[model samples]
Target chain A: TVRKNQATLTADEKRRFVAAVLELKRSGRYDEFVRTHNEFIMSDTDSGERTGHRSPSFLPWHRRFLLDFEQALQSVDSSVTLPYWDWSADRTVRASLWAPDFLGGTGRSTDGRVMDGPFAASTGNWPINVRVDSRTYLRRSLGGSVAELPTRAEVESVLAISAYDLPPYNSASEGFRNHLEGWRGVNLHNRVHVWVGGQMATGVSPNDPVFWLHHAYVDKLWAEWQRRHPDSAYVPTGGTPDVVDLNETMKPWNTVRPADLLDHTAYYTFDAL
Target chain B: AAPESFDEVYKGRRIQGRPAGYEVFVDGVQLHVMRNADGSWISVVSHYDPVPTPRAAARAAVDELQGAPLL
Candidate 1:
């Protein structure tokens, strides 16, 4: 039940994780996950009702989403679990997280195609089936689009936010959710996507295996925020317009609520949490 | 009053945006766009990355497609 840092994963753990991820790709089950995320990203809006992103339910929605993915991974290999990428610490492209044995390094210059790693299109095991572009290869121009990832101090500032979310609870919201979601503040989640470039920056981001690692860390930050503000909780707790109240059931899985997911312990614990 | 409307070819694709909505097209096939309260935009194909305007959003979709047929 422990989710470890991507950098801390042992060689054996890395191998198992990569194998399982590629198997998910080969089995044709992985593309649906990418498609689902694209659907939510396109639908999650500020003008109308929102569910997955740019809303208070962003955390809970993604938490459930990751759990669904992790469950699928476990179905292939029981030992596999999602690992996090603390981009704050591993900010450089040289970090071992991008090793050939892992996610591979940044995409090549000409077309931003990933020429190495198990996910490289040349491997034939990983294909860009669920994609926006015509190209059928995995690509990532890490550190190409953005200069830097969010620093530890920036993450600390976001975590210190006392309120869960503010009015106009979309990308423009002034609370922790919008800030961490990377719409208004220093741009955490979205910036990483941009920095990774290629498919990671697009709507169907899950096309890149690194997408899960990045999100696992973002999810971990939410847990850390809860610990920092024990008394503070999700806003719009009861009645709200459009926004997902703490007690309200989220979409795509109308059965789960934010309240049901506040405690990560119910599902799984972090390696250090 | 009707919301201000914009009709132009951005990145070779026709794009239209009104007060509350925006629409994009590639070779006359309409593409879906989701408008944000903050004046940012996303599409089904390039949903995560937010652009500042509907025109830019439409351009982004065209760029992402790289001439791929939008299914």
Candidate 2:
């Protein structure tokens, strides 16, 4: 099954995807997705019962989270799948992926207010359903953080690390997972958060249209890691308390255990990593 | 003291507690704040970034509230 790349999505595909997402929102499924992500991101720390955030399980954890979301989307419209955004390569607003057909162009410089996307305030169809700020609607200021996206050379350097994760198994640990997470050292995820400043850098990050695309690519990277290390699997298999053991349940969705979600293939396939 | 369930009307708001989560009351309105794994916290008011402490998280809710009740 080939999921369409956002950059290559046809106009019809884009409309259908947006409708499917909105439908999920209307049906009360979208908030669960948001809440589940927040719970994991907040809890998966470098210290104290870490599972999804700092430990080797971080990659798989998010991979499973994305799959959960993708499955939700599929339940609405089986044809609508998540599309990734390669922010590093798309250094400018002119990238085909951000065209009117896909997510549309970035916001103008004055206030980082998006002017062209389907979610633009003018359209009013894509409201900031689950947000946390005074302002409504999506906004982004890519390159506003440190004024640059990571270069290919940098991404390569990170992906080349073999250890996968550091000891102590916390978010602050200095290993592949934390570094890639960009919270402890050299910043990966945080940099992107900063890059997409304004509504993105703030608590209402989902307000940014690029949020879905960005997470899709992040999810893709997890798939890539899995392909690179088929032998190495999720960690903290047993006797882990407070944290999710292999078969332990994740909050918000107490019925589904980590074991139930370890494999992404149960939900969706990748683009051949 | 642990503020005895965070119920001390900070800045004219009533902050209450629940079994599963806590609530912040600004001008008599309740805003729910949940505890996360890292000892940090989150609320519907500030969903993305996790703050270091519950008070910080509560204050963030206040800031986002922007003088409104538990915004």
Candidate 3:
């Protein structure tokens, strides 16, 4: 399987992907994904047992998470693959990724409700069921929280970090994982979440389909980081408390370990990487 | 170590945080907040962006809330 940039997907690819996502939503299968993500985010503490976020497993955890989502999408429509949104390149609200046919434009100023696209609540196709807030509508505020997305230069700086992760392997770890996770340094992944705003900024971010695209790009960066620094790999090899050690199994998928997901090519490759 | 209990109105919204589990609230509604190993904090409202403290996370949530009532 191959994951292409959302910008490069053909009209049919876009349509099929959107249809599969909508079908998942229609069948109530999508809300569980949202609920699972929020459960992990709410529970994944910095000092306690952490998984899915804020730990060395952040990358591989999401790698497995994204694959599960892709598998669901495939079950709906076999021709579809998850697409990525390179926020560094597509920083503007005017990017084609926000066109009405795509993820739709930013939410209106008053309520942040996404008013267009296939997922628009008005289309009766998408509903915000599993959410922290009461508003049961899709919403976004492109560039609402933060000013600009990370630039390619910023991304390059993060990619150059040779260590997979350092001591105290949570958000505070001063290494590539935390940097790419956007807890410190130039702020890559987290900034994109904030830039998208609305549901994207909250724990139940998967409510918006763009969450997958955003994470796809993040996964790609992990791949690029590996290629750039072959010597660096997931740290905290073993016996570490409150963290998923390099060889230990990650939660939500006890069968898989960071060791198994270190190679993205084992499952799928980016269109260009 | 938890920070001292704090209760203040930020941008017209009542925000509070206590050492008790490092709990935080916005306008009387409990807001889920977590502390990082490095001592920073984040809320469900702003999960990705870490703030300096639970109070800061609450304040950040108030800002992100934009007058929209929290659940």
Candidate 4:
């Protein structure tokens, strides 16, 4: 499957993608994705057994997670594939990424509820079943909590880091993985989460459909990083505890190893890069 | 070390936290929170931005809620 940029998708492509996602939501299949993400966000830690986030495996783990979600999308509509939102380039509320016909614009100031879009609570098509709070509608304060999304220059800076990950191998670690993960350095991923507040800001961020697009972009960045530094690769080749070593299998998906997912072309392709 | 349990009203909402790694609540609704290895805390409400303590996390939630109820 080819994952295209959300900005570049034709009018028909956006409609189909939205239809497929709403179908998954209607069929009672979408909330599990939110639950799965929330589970890992809460459990995966810097010091303990970490697999999904804040450790060296954050990249591969989320790659696998997004792959599964994309596969589900294809099941509903064969023409649909996950699209990415390049926040750096499309870095404003006015960007087409948030238009009403697409993901919709930012929330109203009073409550932060996204009043438009296929996923809006008013649509009755998207209900936030898996949540940390009471309100069940999709929410986003695009550029609310945070004043600005990271610019392309900032993203390029993070993409320029050499080592994949370093010792201690946690949020405090200094390397490409942690930096890209946004726990350290320029704060690429987490900054986006904060920038799009409401449901996007929470642990159950998958509640917002943009979560997939955001992660797909993050996954793309990882692919770009690999190309830029061909010699640098996944670290902790062996004997790392509470961390998924290069060859060790990741959690929830006990069969797939990080080594199994180091290459993105094996599973899917981005339209560019 | 675990933080001491406390209960108080912040921003017109009752927030509480006990050491169950920990068990935090806003107006009686449980707020899922986690602690990183660096002695920082992140509540589900503000998952990406880690605060310094569970109390801080609870307060952040109350503020984020903006007077809305959790449930």
Q: Give the poorly placed runs of model 2, Cα more than 4 Å off.
A: A39-57, A108-111, A259-262, B1-70
lDDT of 2 by residue, A79-177 (tens): 878878766676665787667656666667765677876667788666655654546556665565457766666666666655555455565455566
In candidate 3, what are the lDDT values of residues A61-117, reduced to their tens digit? 999999999999999998899999998898898888999878888899988888888
Scanning candidate 2 chain B in windows of ten residues, the lowest lDDT window is B1-10
- What DockQ does each listed candidate score? 0.50, 0.15, 0.69, 0.70
Model 1 per-residue lDDT tens digits across residues A220-262: 9999999999988887787888889989999898998999999
lDDT of each: 0.85, 0.62, 0.89, 0.90
Measured against the true structure, the TM-scores of the candidates, in listed sequence, are 0.92, 0.73, 0.96, 0.96
Instruction: Name the DockQ score for candidate 1.
Output: 0.50
Worst 10 residues of 2 chain A by lDDT: A38-47
lDDT of 4 by residue, B1-71 (tens): 79899899997889999987679999999888888777888888999988899999999998788787875
True contacts kept of 4: 0.73
lDDT of 4 by residue, A128-159 (tens): 88986778777788887788888889898988
Per-candidate interface C-alpha RMSD? 2.5, 5.3, 1.5, 1.5
Output the lDDT of residue A58, model 1. 92
Q: Which clashing pairs does model 1 show?
A: none
* Per-chain TM-score of candidate 1, chain B: 0.71
